[PDB]
Design an enzyme around this catalytic site. Structure first.
Site, PDB file in Angstrom:
ATOM      1  N   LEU A   1      57.697 -15.016  -9.487  1.00 17.29           N
ATOM      2  CA  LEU A   1      58.364 -13.836  -9.997  1.00 17.29           C
ATOM      3  C   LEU A   1      59.763 -13.956 -10.577  1.00 17.29           C
ATOM      4  CD1 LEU A   1      57.342 -11.175 -10.551  1.00 17.29           C
ATOM      5  CD2 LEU A   1      57.988 -10.408  -8.277  1.00 17.29           C
TER       6      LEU A   1
ATOM      7  N   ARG B   1      52.170   2.284  -6.374  1.00 15.39           N
ATOM      8  CA  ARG B   1      53.279   2.130  -5.459  1.00 15.39           C
ATOM      9  C   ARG B   1      54.604   2.045  -6.219  1.00 15.39           C
ATOM     10  NH1 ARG B   1      56.058  -2.741  -6.777  1.00 15.39           N
ATOM     11  NH2 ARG B   1      57.172  -3.497  -4.915  1.00 15.39           N
TER      12      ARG B   1
ATOM     13  N   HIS C   1      50.118  -8.094  -8.266  1.00 16.85           N
ATOM     14  CA  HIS C   1      51.334  -8.143  -7.464  1.00 16.85           C
ATOM     15  C   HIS C   1      51.285  -7.431  -6.106  1.00 16.85           C
ATOM     16  CE1 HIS C   1      55.597  -8.357  -6.651  1.00 16.85           C
ATOM     17  NE2 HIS C   1      55.744  -7.047  -6.731  1.00 16.85           N
TER      18      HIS C   1
ATOM     19  N   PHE D   1      66.470   0.311  -9.504  1.00 20.03           N
ATOM     20  CA  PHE D   1      65.232  -0.414  -9.283  1.00 20.03           C
ATOM     21  C   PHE D   1      64.053   0.516  -9.032  1.00 20.03           C
ATOM     22  CE2 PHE D   1      62.297  -2.782  -6.600  1.00 20.03           C
ATOM     23  CZ  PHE D   1      62.091  -3.863  -7.420  1.00 20.03           C
TER      24      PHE D   1
ATOM     25  N   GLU E   1      62.742  -7.803 -11.768  1.00 10.79           N
ATOM     26  CA  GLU E   1      62.788  -6.693 -12.719  1.00 10.79           C
ATOM     27  C   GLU E   1      64.166  -6.594 -13.371  1.00 10.79           C
ATOM     28  OE1 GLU E   1      61.169  -2.688 -11.538  1.00 10.79           O
ATOM     29  OE2 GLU E   1      63.224  -2.016 -11.906  1.00 10.79           O
TER      30      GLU E   1
ATOM     31  N   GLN F   1      48.075  -3.171  -8.123  1.00 15.15           N
ATOM     32  CA  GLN F   1      49.207  -3.099  -9.034  1.00 15.15           C
ATOM     33  C   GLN F   1      49.592  -4.460  -9.594  1.00 15.15           C
ATOM     34  OE1 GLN F   1      53.466  -2.064  -8.029  1.00 15.15           O
ATOM     35  NE2 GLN F   1      52.732  -0.031  -8.645  1.00 15.15           N
TER      36      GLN F   1
ATOM     37  N   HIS G   1      52.404  -6.844 -12.032  1.00 15.31           N
ATOM     38  CA  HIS G   1      53.810  -6.944 -12.377  1.00 15.31           C
ATOM     39  C   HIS G   1      53.796  -7.516 -13.791  1.00 15.31           C
ATOM     40  CE1 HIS G   1      58.166  -7.871 -11.515  1.00 15.31           C
ATOM     41  NE2 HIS G   1      57.939  -8.523 -12.640  1.00 15.31           N
TER      42      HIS G   1
ATOM     43  N   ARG H   1      57.306   0.106 -15.702  1.00 19.13           N
ATOM     44  CA  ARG H   1      56.671  -1.203 -15.539  1.00 19.13           C
ATOM     45  C   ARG H   1      55.186  -1.094 -15.850  1.00 19.13           C
ATOM     46  NH1 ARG H   1      59.779  -5.685 -12.853  1.00 19.13           N
ATOM     47  NH2 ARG H   1      59.635  -6.045 -15.119  1.00 19.13           N
TER      48      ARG H   1
HETATM   49  C1  FAD Z   1      54.498 -10.987  -3.460  1.00 23.20           C
HETATM   50  C2  FAD Z   1      55.767 -10.180  -3.601  1.00 23.20           C
HETATM   51  C3  FAD Z   1      55.798  -8.888  -3.051  1.00 23.20           C
HETATM   52  C4  FAD Z   1      56.959  -8.085  -3.155  1.00 23.20           C
HETATM   53  C5  FAD Z   1      58.121  -8.569  -3.817  1.00 23.20           C
HETATM   54  C6  FAD Z   1      58.086  -9.889  -4.374  1.00 23.20           C
HETATM   55  C7  FAD Z   1      56.949 -10.689  -4.279  1.00 23.20           C
HETATM   56  C8  FAD Z   1      56.937 -12.078  -4.874  1.00 23.20           C
HETATM   57  N1  FAD Z   1      59.281  -7.828  -3.938  1.00 23.20           N
HETATM   58  C9  FAD Z   1      59.310  -6.579  -3.410  1.00 23.20           C
HETATM   59  C10 FAD Z   1      60.520  -5.783  -3.512  1.00 23.20           C
HETATM   60  O1  FAD Z   1      61.527  -6.178  -4.047  1.00 23.20           O
HETATM   61  N2  FAD Z   1      60.492  -4.516  -2.960  1.00 23.20           N
HETATM   62  C11 FAD Z   1      59.324  -4.011  -2.312  1.00 23.20           C
HETATM   63  O2  FAD Z   1      59.399  -2.906  -1.871  1.00 23.20           O
HETATM   64  N3  FAD Z   1      58.212  -4.736  -2.198  1.00 23.20           N
HETATM   65  C12 FAD Z   1      58.151  -5.989  -2.714  1.00 23.20           C
HETATM   66  N4  FAD Z   1      57.032  -6.745  -2.594  1.00 23.20           N
HETATM   67  C13 FAD Z   1      55.806  -6.375  -1.886  1.00 23.20           C
HETATM   68  C14 FAD Z   1      56.243  -6.494  -0.370  1.00 23.20           C
HETATM   69  O3  FAD Z   1      57.040  -7.657  -0.172  1.00 23.20           O
HETATM   70  C15 FAD Z   1      55.028  -6.474   0.540  1.00 23.20           C
HETATM   71  O4  FAD Z   1      54.218  -5.334   0.362  1.00 23.20           O
HETATM   72  C16 FAD Z   1      55.460  -6.597   2.028  1.00 23.20           C
HETATM   73  O5  FAD Z   1      56.343  -7.723   2.300  1.00 23.20           O
HETATM   74  C17 FAD Z   1      54.176  -6.681   2.851  1.00 23.20           C
HETATM   75  O6  FAD Z   1      54.542  -6.897   4.385  1.00 23.20           O
HETATM   76  P1  FAD Z   1      53.418  -7.097   5.396  1.00 23.20           P
HETATM   77  O7  FAD Z   1      54.147  -7.101   6.762  1.00 23.20           O
HETATM   78  O8  FAD Z   1      52.449  -6.112   5.289  1.00 23.20           O
HETATM   79  O9  FAD Z   1      52.703  -8.383   5.125  1.00 23.20           O
HETATM   80  P2  FAD Z   1      53.116  -9.906   4.863  1.00 23.20           P
HETATM   81  O10 FAD Z   1      54.484 -10.050   4.877  1.00 23.20           O
HETATM   82  O11 FAD Z   1      52.316 -10.440   3.719  1.00 23.20           O
HETATM   83  O12 FAD Z   1      52.532 -10.672   6.056  1.00 23.20           O
HETATM   84  C18 FAD Z   1      51.106 -10.755   6.362  1.00 23.20           C
HETATM   85  C19 FAD Z   1      50.988 -11.563   7.683  1.00 23.20           C
HETATM   86  O13 FAD Z   1      49.568 -11.599   8.041  1.00 23.20           O
HETATM   87  C20 FAD Z   1      49.276 -12.948   8.529  1.00 23.20           C
HETATM   88  N5  FAD Z   1      47.819 -13.013   8.402  1.00 23.20           N
HETATM   89  C21 FAD Z   1      47.053 -12.745   7.278  1.00 23.20           C
HETATM   90  N6  FAD Z   1      45.749 -12.885   7.505  1.00 23.20           N
HETATM   91  C22 FAD Z   1      45.656 -13.259   8.824  1.00 23.20           C
HETATM   92  C23 FAD Z   1      44.498 -13.562   9.687  1.00 23.20           C
HETATM   93  N7  FAD Z   1      43.245 -13.516   9.289  1.00 23.20           N
HETATM   94  N8  FAD Z   1      44.818 -13.907  10.986  1.00 23.20           N
HETATM   95  C24 FAD Z   1      46.103 -13.968  11.448  1.00 23.20           C
HETATM   96  N9  FAD Z   1      47.219 -13.704  10.732  1.00 23.20           N
HETATM   97  C25 FAD Z   1      46.946 -13.353   9.423  1.00 23.20           C
HETATM   98  C26 FAD Z   1      50.099 -13.824   7.662  1.00 23.20           C
HETATM   99  O14 FAD Z   1      50.263 -15.117   8.189  1.00 23.20           O
HETATM  100  C27 FAD Z   1      51.441 -13.055   7.674  1.00 23.20           C
HETATM  101  O15 FAD Z   1      52.335 -13.410   8.679  1.00 23.20           O
END
Ligand code: FAD
Ligand code: FAD
Ligand code: HEM
Ligand code: HEM
Ligand code: HEM
Ligand code: HEM
Ligand code: LMT
Ligand code: LMT
Ligand code: SF4
Ligand code: F3S
Ligand code: FES
Ligand code: NA
Lengths: 655, 254, 239, 254, 55
Positions: A267, A404, A369, A141, A270, A255, A257, A301
């Site tokens: 999604l 990334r 993505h 992967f 891959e 980036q 996808h 990709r």
């Molecule tokens: C979209 C996606 C990304 C992804 C993936 C498949 C999909 C459909 N598969 C991946 C994979 O197999 N391997 C990998 O390494 N990465 C993969 N990705 C990307 C990855 O999942 C993300 O980069 C990662 O999960 C990001 O984690 P992070 O902890 O940074 O963020 P999050 O999970 O999106 O959570 C964001 C949180 O913030 C809260 N939030 C947002 N705005 C606010 C405000 N204004 N106030 C309060 N809270 C806020 C959200 O509610 C959430 O909890």
């Protein structure tokens, strides 16, 4: 006035925020995690590919170590990353996997024996020895030679997120959902917390803390087509930006996808093409071999996405009421293979596309993505605004640069959670803050007045029409291929959209549980974020990583070996202020060169790169001749920092 | 009341600071009494249906339960003890199972509304379990007391008398459907509740248990209706005002 | 064309003194591969921006969009209008959860409470060194744990449960499944007696009436029927 | 299910945003059915006790209830309707009152412990109300069904037959104490629950109602035991195997 | 560290403290009343003589 205090405030309940919360809470710091939604529903939960970490357990992982993971990361970033940060990351990833395993994450394990595997260079048989049995497995992967992507069957992000969330519950972390940070409280260049809007009651509350960490995820929803959850709107990014002090890094580095389901954006892993999935055009023609005779379907990709758009522009795309797309044929893999190795993808096409993949082709199109860009921090995770930290996709710690690695982002979320968590904890424990009620009242009253003005606005603009136009502009002009002419048009229209967002009028007047009011203040925020992306793209006259300028096809290591820093110092300005942070080749363990994927000699060489390269080869040879280990050599090339707790080496099968 | 029961009532735990094991025991006994009654009823339906094989047949079976092979013409009092025992289990079961009824307006309204919205088979079947259970408080008690106090009046002739002349048929007709629906559904839920036969393909096992439940019910209902008709027909032919039918079968071998 | 759909939605704002519970109808023209997710957003952006509802992943992975769709708790983002040969779709918020407004309920906080109640985390005496090799686990065991760990806390099995609807303190199918998920995990050192102290009462496993609606509506198809029975057999045998 | 019942189930209020009036109606009907049964039983005890005044007396009273002054020898079916009606109220009352039973281990344990610790008269009496109520599910149903289906078997001779020969006396003996304790306590609590006679000195009124409750119970129990003996004595004298006692009283005037 | 904020902090839940709390709360100031015991059990409750006022 309503005020809530905690020693450590975490904004964002995804992998990064929750893991950082564990770090602070375990050392006695009262911590609060704010989240728009229940934390276990964060976008992190959707990850199905896996997490990259150099364990070296399986046969195809044999020999893997920090150095190999480091190189894949740096070259993948097209040299736009801070290599010291990348080093902190790769050395810690193995311990993140292992800690999660101890927390119960059901990582798929290795069983002794032979297995029918697809190498796509020799789809032969792989053998796992008895001494590897029961250890954490890995799969192909992200295009790395060494298979180091760990996974829990087909729901890695899900199981990882649940474990960290459960640890927060174990430790008594205060999880407060349906709470949105709409502004950061700051004074004298220091961050003292955030103004928060309770989405249910509408109350405006000041959350004050000795330290604040933003882990709000990516900003993909500024695009019409994205794989991101509907909550990834970058408001966390915007509130940092609106302080006028914190800066955003490489916002133009977005980036895409290649094979998300069209037009939903759901999604299709891959593994489809990795197993043998075939891309076809309007005539059912397998076109990848035409552009990539050698790699074909299995090209990077990054390359597949470009070829797909090129093929569509040549008039070979499939016409649809939602736009043009292409086809993904996985039936060719045989119904048996699909229902045993891709049972998940089969359910997707049925539950949403309403088609059986073992028979019909799935419509696909490259879509936004991942967000490499984000809040700029130092290696510790702290932003220019003191006391404000950031981790995860919301940040630009910059281990990703302009591209990334697949599997490095969920890995970063947890790793940064651990590392930035330590530095964040240290800051909260040692810093002393002066909380002036005059300041708190100003910010709280300012937002209450803002909410009132939105509800009383007699403006005639429609927030949804403005938000939808923004997304089209982003997709049409700031996608896979970009050019100055279109980018200039995009910036001008986005700026006009921003001005009109201020004349929005809403129907529902209530202050509580009002989705319409929510859009009224979020959209203007999204527009400022979009402006940083578009403008950063327009000004960056070069092609690097995921940023492709058709009018500047070469990577310019002479003028653009840097990082874009966006800010919004004056609340009156309608365009972001851009500055640049130059990357020092002298501090690089690996001098700029060929990234591995894409056309060769497509970069303008920097004389300093050649000098440094020679310097590196020299240091290696000498130390290598003196019988020195890879660790001592690494230190000599580029020393990096790590919190004491994670300074240890990673034991591997075979030491 | 004992010191231990006081300590448990006031603290919520036993003197050893553990949760009471009583809830577990009560759950076990509710199912045990249910299982007993369910199996008992199946056998009951076969014996009572012997009337379809002829008066001499059921008469012979009746005499066996009265320990014919131990006493002269058998002692009816044997059936009295049998009836008393089943009555006790009947009461114990009702006592324990009653804990599961919706118990106030809110519970009744919300569950009933949920049942109608869901149109979910196994949920609807539980409602039937509850309804038939409540109905048997009144229907079953009548029959059990009589069998216990008038065992010598059981026979191809005497039973038909009670069936028709004493107007027991309307009660038997309703009780027949009530106990069969309650019984079969109960045995079925018992199987999936404790998962005795789950195995490796639980969903297949359940699918089969549901089929078996329907067949068992259909068969026993038909058999029950035929047996019903038999007793009724015979009862309608007892027109001799000079014949004491109630104790006829008894007046054959003391 | 695409036939006209009749969408009937429950609307009620408990925080507004003048709000009264009622149904509101919308006329929507169906389109290919249309889901309730698309329907609700169309309604929000062009017909009624007042309506409250919760979507996140829109891919059936997060458990955010559970609601009663024609009497059955389901994931709205995974529900196709095409499957309703009648064109009439009635949407209700999930019962058994605190209502926020319209189709929006608080599943998240009930679940966090449930997770704390059954102590949903690994219980181990010593911390394993994260710089060393992980403890080995049979692949079959990892797979079994994963199967039960797939729960997305959507709340459909909670809302589908007549028992929960009547008796709010009932831990629910999701809570019973969570107990088993740790019970079969070699990393967790709790014994059967420990689990009994958590759910060995009438608000726990003995409160289950085996309605099995949880099993029949679970969007992840967890083996709730056999797993709950498994737990019941073990808890009834404690002591 | 209707739209209104759905809205009430999901919102907790009626479409007008008010709390349901059903709880009030159910409370009213529970007490109404209780009052009816309590008064009915008092009259019942007087009419069944006429046996103490002589066979001709109760026989005459029995014929009146069968509408003697409207039909030839009176129609027993009249008593069948009377019995059916009382049976319906009996069931409706049990259905409503059942809502008040302790319904799980915790409730049962804590209340029982509280009752024993308190040694409070009116609390202990409620427990007796609950116990006797549960017992009557089984005892009362037997008697009610028979009176409804065999009304022509009521008389100074026929009733004594059932009492002794059909072994109904053990059930009557227990049911006598059960319904009298339940009935008198119930009428008493009904008075203080609704305060119909509170007046200006509530405490005095209650003190008097409690005394009246005890006297009523004592008197009716004695009268009940005497009447019991009467039926038993007569039943024990029916030794002629050639006499059809069960339908004797009926075989006098059709 | 555990910290609780309010605009007006009242220590004591007797007649004086509770009445002062009414004064601050009625004008939008978030107020907290701290008390050793449930406020209605304060010594003020024992007064049986009366309250002096020139009506
Ligand atoms: C979209 C996606 C990304 C992804 C993936 C498949 C999909 C459909 N598969 C991946 C994979 O197999 N391997 C990998 O390494 N990465 C993969 N990705 C990307 C990855 O999942 C993300 O980069 C990662 O999960 C990001 O984690 P992070 O902890 O940074 O963020 P999050 O999970 O999106 O959570 C964001 C949180 O913030 C809260 N939030 C947002 N705005 C606010 C405000 N204004 N106030 C309060 N809270 C806020 C959200 O509610 C959430 O909890
Ligand atoms: C003792 C007494 C006084 C009295 C009286 C009869 C008795 C037995 N009769 C009176 C009468 O007829 N007419 C009259 O004018 N005065 C009479 N008095 C005296 C009068 O009642 C008192 O002066 C008056 O009630 C005092 O009111 P105040 O509001 O000041 O105080 P309080 O009621 O005692 O309540 C004190 C509260 O403080 C809390 N507390 C105390 N220490 C702490 C700390 N360290 N932390 C937090 N809370 C604290 C107490 O819990 C209480 O609520
Ligand atoms: C011959 C008579 C009866 C038979 C054959 C019988 C049988 C059964 C069986 C097999 C069960 C399954 C028990 C379990 O799941 O643990 C059951 C459940 C039940 N029965 Fe009966 N029963 C009888 C009479 C009654 C009576 C008089 C009542 C009245 C209160 C009653 C009320 C119930 C209820 C409500 C349940 C469901 C219990 C639950 O959901 O846990 N039953 N019965
Ligand atoms: C040991 C106790 C029992 C004995 C000795 C017994 C005996 C009999 C006998 C002899 C009959 C035939 C008619 C008659 O003689 O009046 C009968 C019929 C019947 N019994 Fe029972 N019974 C017992 C328990 C039960 C129970 C617990 C139930 C259910 C609550 C039940 C339900 C029925 C029904 C529905 C019929 C009608 C059969 C038909 O018409 O198909 N019996 N019983
Ligand atoms: C001839 C038969 C019966 C008579 C004379 C009778 C009479 C009464 C009376 C006068 C009350 C007072 C009601 C009130 O306070 O509103 C009462 C209460 C009650 N009865 Fe009965 N009853 C009879 C049978 C039953 C049966 C079969 C049950 C079985 C469930 C039952 C269960 C109860 C209970 C538990 C109460 C207490 C209700 C409460 O606390 O609100 N009764 N009854
Ligand atoms: C309209 C319905 C009723 C009628 C026609 C009726 C009729 C009679 C008759 C004729 C007797 C004398 C013995 C016999 O003939 O078997 C009797 C006795 C008895 N009845 Fe009823 N009854 C009715 C309702 C009730 C109810 C609801 C209860 C209580 C739940 C009750 C409790 C008793 C008791 C305890 C005796 C024994 C009297 C004694 O020995 O002092 N009856 N009944
Ligand atoms: C089906 C057997 C029931 C098992 C016994 C235990 C559960 C039921 C009793 C406890 C709860 C009391 O239940 C209460 O009964 C009354 C009946 O007068 C119902 O009343 C409602 O349904 C009845 C029956 O369809 C209608 O005639 C009536 O007009 C309607 O308002 C209440 O909505 C219910 O909440
Ligand atoms: C008195 C009539 C009761 C009215 C019916 C409704 C209330 C009672 C049933 C619902 C609650 C279940 O009640 C449960 O019954 C079992 C009896 O097997 C009791 O069990 C306890 O008391 C019984 C009777 O003295 C003892 O033989 C037993 O050893 C003891 O453990 C539980 O402590 C009680 O909590
Ligand atoms: S067990 Fe199934 S229905 Fe219940 S919360 Fe989990 S995934 Fe949803
Ligand atoms: S529906 Fe409820 S009753 Fe038990 S079987 Fe599932 S948790
Ligand atoms: S929006 Fe996530 S499951 Fe439906
Ligand atoms: Na980023």
């Amino acid at each position: 006035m309503k005020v809530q205090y905690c020693d450590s405030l975490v904004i964002g309940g995804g992998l990064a925020g929750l893991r950082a919360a564990v770090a602070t809470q375990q050392k006695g710091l009262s911590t609060i995690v704010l989240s728009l939604i229940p934390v276990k529903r964060s976008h992190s939960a959707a990850a199905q590919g896996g997490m990259q970490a150099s364990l070296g357990n399986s046969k195809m992982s044999d020999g893997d170590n920090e150095d190999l993971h480091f190189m894949d990361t740096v070259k993948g970033s097209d040299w736009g990353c801070d290599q010291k940060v990348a080093r902190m990351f790769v050395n810690t990833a193995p311990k993140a996997i292992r800690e999660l395993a101890a927390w119960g994450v059901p990582w798929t394990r290795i069983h002794k024996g032979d297995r029918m595997a697809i190498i796509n260079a020799q789809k032969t048989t792989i053998t796992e020895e008895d001494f590897r049995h029961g250890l954490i497995h890995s799969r192909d992967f992200g295009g790395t030679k060494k298979w180091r992507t760990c996974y829990t069957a087909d729901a890695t992000g899900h199981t990882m997120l649940f474990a960290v969330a459960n640890e927060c519950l174990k430790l008594g972390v205060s999880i407060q959902d349906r709470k949105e940070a709409i502004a950061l409280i700051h004074q004298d260049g220091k961050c003292y917390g955030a103004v928060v809007r309770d989405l249910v009651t509408g109350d405006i509350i000041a959350y004050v803390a000795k330290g604040t960490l933003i882990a709000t995820g990516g900003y993909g929803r500024i695009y019409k087509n994205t794989t991101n959850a509907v909550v990834c709107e970058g408001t966390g990014t915007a509130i940092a930006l609106e302080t006028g002090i914190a800066q955003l890094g490489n916002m133009e580095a977005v980036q895409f996808h290649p094979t998300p389901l069209f037009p939903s954006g759901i999604l299709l892993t891959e593994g489809c093409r990795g197993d043998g999935g075939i891309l076809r055009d309007v005539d059912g023609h397998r076109f990848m071999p035409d552009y990539e005779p050698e790699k074909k379907e299995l090209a990077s990709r990054d390359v597949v996405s470009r070829r797909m758009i090129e093929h569509i522009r040549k008039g070979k795309g499939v016409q649809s009421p939602y736009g043009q797309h292409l086809w993904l044929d996985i039936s060719i893999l045989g119904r048996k293979h699909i229902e045993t190795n891709l049972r998940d993808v089969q359910e997707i096409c049925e539950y949403f596309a309403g088609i059986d993949p073992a028979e019909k082709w799935a419509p696909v199109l490259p879509m936004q993505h991942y967000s490499m860009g984000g809040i700029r921090t130092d290696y510790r995770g702290e932003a220019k605004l003191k006391g404000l930290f950031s981790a995860g996709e919301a940040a630009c710690w910059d281990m990703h640069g302009f591209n990334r690695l697949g599997g490095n982002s969920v890995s970063e979320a947890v790793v940064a959670g651990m590392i930035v968590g330590e530095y964040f904890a240290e800051h909260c424990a040692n810093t002393q803050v002066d909380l002036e009620t005059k300041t708190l009242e100003k910010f709280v009253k300012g937002q209450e007045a803002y909410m009132k003005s939105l509800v009383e606005s007699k403006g005639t603009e429609d927030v949804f029409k403005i938000k939808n136009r923004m997304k089209d502009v982003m997709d049409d002009n700031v996608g896979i291929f970009r050019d100055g002419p279109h980018l200039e048009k995009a910036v001008k229209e986005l700026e006009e959209l921003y001005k009109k967002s201020k004349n929005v009028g809403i129907k529902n007047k209530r202050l509580h549980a009002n989705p319409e009011l929510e859009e009224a203040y979020r959209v203007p925020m999204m527009l400022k974020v979009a402006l940083c992306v578009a403008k950063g793209a327009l000004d960056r006259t070069e092609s690097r990583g995921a940023h492709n300028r058709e009018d500047y096809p070469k990577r310019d290591d002479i003028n653009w070996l840097n990082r874009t820093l966006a800010s919004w110092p004056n609340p009156e300005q309608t365009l972001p202020t851009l500055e640049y942070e130059a990357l020092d080749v002298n501090e690089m363990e690996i001098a700029p060169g060929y990234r591995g994927y894409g056309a060769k000699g497509n970069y303008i060489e920097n004389p300093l790169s050649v000098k440094r390269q020679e310097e590196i080869d020299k240091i290696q040879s000498e130390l290598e001749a003196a019988g020195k280990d890879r660790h001592a050599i690494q230190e000599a090339l580029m020393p990096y920092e790590l919190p004491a707790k994670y300074k240890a080496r990673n034991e591997r099968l075979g030491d | 009341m004992t010191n231990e029961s006081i300590l448990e009532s006031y603290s919520g735990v036993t003197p050893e600071r553990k949760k009471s094991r009583m809830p577990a025991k009560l759950d076990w006994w509710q199912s045990a009494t249910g299982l007993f009654l369910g199996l008992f009823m199946i056998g009951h339906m076969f014996f009572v249906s012997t009337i379809l094989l002829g008066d001499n047949v059921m008469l012979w079976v009746t005499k066996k339960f009265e320990l014919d092979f131990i006493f002269e013409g058998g002692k009816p009092i044997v059936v009295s003890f049998l009836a008393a025992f089943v009555f006790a289990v009947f009461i114990a079961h009702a006592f324990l199972a009653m804990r599961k009824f919706p118990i106030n307006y809110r519970q009744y309204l919300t569950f009933k509304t949920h049942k109608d919205l869901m149109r979910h088979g196994d949920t609807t079947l539980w409602w039937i379990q509850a309804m038939t259970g409540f109905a048997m408080f009144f229907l079953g008690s009548v029959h059990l007391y009589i069998m216990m106090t008038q065992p010598q009046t059981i026979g191809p002739v005497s039973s038909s008398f009670r069936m028709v002349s004493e107007w027991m048929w309307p009660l038997y007709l309703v009780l027949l459907f009530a106990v069969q629906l309650h019984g079969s559904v109960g045995l079925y839920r018992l199987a999936v509740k404790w998962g005795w036969f789950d195995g490796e393909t639980p969903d297949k096992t359940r699918a089969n248990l549901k089929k078996l439940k329907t067949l068992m019910s259909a068969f026993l209902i038909v058999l029950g209706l035929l047996t019903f008709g038999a007793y009724v027909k015979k009862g309608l032919e007892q027109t001799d005002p000079n014949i004491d039918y109630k104790y006829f079968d008894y007046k054959r071998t003391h | 064309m695409g036939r006209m759909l009749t969408i009937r939605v429950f609307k009620y704002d408990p925080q507004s003194a003048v709000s009264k519970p009622h149904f509101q109808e919308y006329k929507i023209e169906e389109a290919p591969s249309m889901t309730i997710f698309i329907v609700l957003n169309m309604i929000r952006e062009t017909y009624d921006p007042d309506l409250n509802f919760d979507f996140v992943c829109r891919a059936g992975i997060c458990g955010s969009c559970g609601m009663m769709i024609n009497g059955r708790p389901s994931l709205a983002c995974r529900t196709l209008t095409k499957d309703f040969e009648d064109g009439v779709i009635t949407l209700l918020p999930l019962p058994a959860f605190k209502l926020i407004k319209d189709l929006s309920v608080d599943t998240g906080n009930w679940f966090n409470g449930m997770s704390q109640r059954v102590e949903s985390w690994i219980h181990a005496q010593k911390e394993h060194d994260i710089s060393k090799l992980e403890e080995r686990i049979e692949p079959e065991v990892a797979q079994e744990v994963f199967e039960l760990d797939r729960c997305i806390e959507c709340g459909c099995c909670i809302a589908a449960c007549g028992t929960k609807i009547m008796r709010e303190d009932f831990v629910g199918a999701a809570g019973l499944n969570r107990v088993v998920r740790f019970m079969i995990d070699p990393h967790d050192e709790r014994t059967d007696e420990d689990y009994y102290e958590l759910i060995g009462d009438d608000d726990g496993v003995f409160g289950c009436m085996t309605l099995l609606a949880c099993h029949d509506v679970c969007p992840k198809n967890l083996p709730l029927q056999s797993k709950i029975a498994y737990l019941r057999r073990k808890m009834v045998s404690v002591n």
